[PDB]
Design a protein around this ligand. Structure first.
Ligand code: NJN
Ligand code: ZN
Length: 209
């Protein structure tokens, strides 16, 4: 595999930065919690740094290329990723060949700047049938995993809510909010090597009250 997970102590400022980013970027969703559950906060159980030399080199190699194509600017962002495939991704890396064709921006890998948006996909598109054990999308019991990832957007194409690759001259798509469309920003890459899954976050959504 080559992948090592480093457990971060809650007293570690690197843990605390990821924890804060996760808690602070929660929003109320217009679906009233249908996809990700009803919560305003998480129980952060565990944050692990993902260390894989092969995957890191794959990422930085792509990043150099994107940079030369975008006026020496990678347009690198730290973004949340949610999917059922977290375990595969930390071992084998992101893989566009596994992309689901039912996305707003076609067959790509979707990231978000709001943790609560990525949380809606941990059990599948629109939350699937919820947690495996209780078939509940708002399950407070079962533990979830998000990735907090290093993502190379390069020259990002701006769009509102049928697409295979980046537009010509572009490296990603930035989905922007619209009245008849997106509520929140999402980012899409069409090459797996434009993201590194840097931190694996184990959490529950917290029951409010
Ligand atoms: C309307 C919202 O649309 C979305 C939201 C998120 C995503 C998305 N963006 N990226 C993803 C996943 C990351 C991709 N998979 C891998 O990189 C992958 C990597 C390595 N092995 C695998 C084995 C099985 C499946 N996937 C893999 C698919 N997905 C995804 C999420 C939930 C279910 C299915 C796909 N796709 C569409
Ligand atoms: Zn459950």
């Amino acid at each position: 595999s080559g992948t090592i997970l480093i457990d971060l102590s809650p007293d570690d400022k690197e843990f605390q930065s990821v924890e804060e980013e996760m808690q602070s970027t929660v929003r109320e969703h217009r679906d009233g919690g249908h996809a990700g559950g009803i919560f305003n906060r998480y129980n952060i159980l565990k944050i692990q740094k993902v260390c894989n030399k092969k995957l890191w080199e794959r990422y930085t190699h792509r990043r150099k290329e994107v940079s030369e194509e975008n006026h020496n600017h990678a347009n690198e962002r730290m973004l949340f990723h949610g999917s059922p495939f977290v375990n595969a991704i930390i071992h084998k890396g992101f893989d566009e060949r596994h992309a689901y064709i039912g996305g707003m921006f076609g067959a790509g890998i979707y990231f978000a700047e709001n943790s609560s948006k990525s949380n809606q996909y941990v059990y599948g598109i629109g939350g699937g049938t919820g947690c495996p054990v209780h078939k509940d999308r708002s399950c407070y019991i079962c533990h979830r995993q998000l990735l907090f990832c290093r993502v190379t957007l390069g020259k990002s194409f701006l769009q509102f809510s049928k697409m295979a690759h980046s537009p010509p001259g572009h490296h990603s798509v930035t989905g922007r909010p619209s009245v008849n469309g997106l509520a929140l920003a999402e980012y899409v890459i069409y090459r797996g090597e434009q993201a590194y899954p840097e931190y694996l976050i184990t959490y529950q959504i917290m029951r409010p009250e």
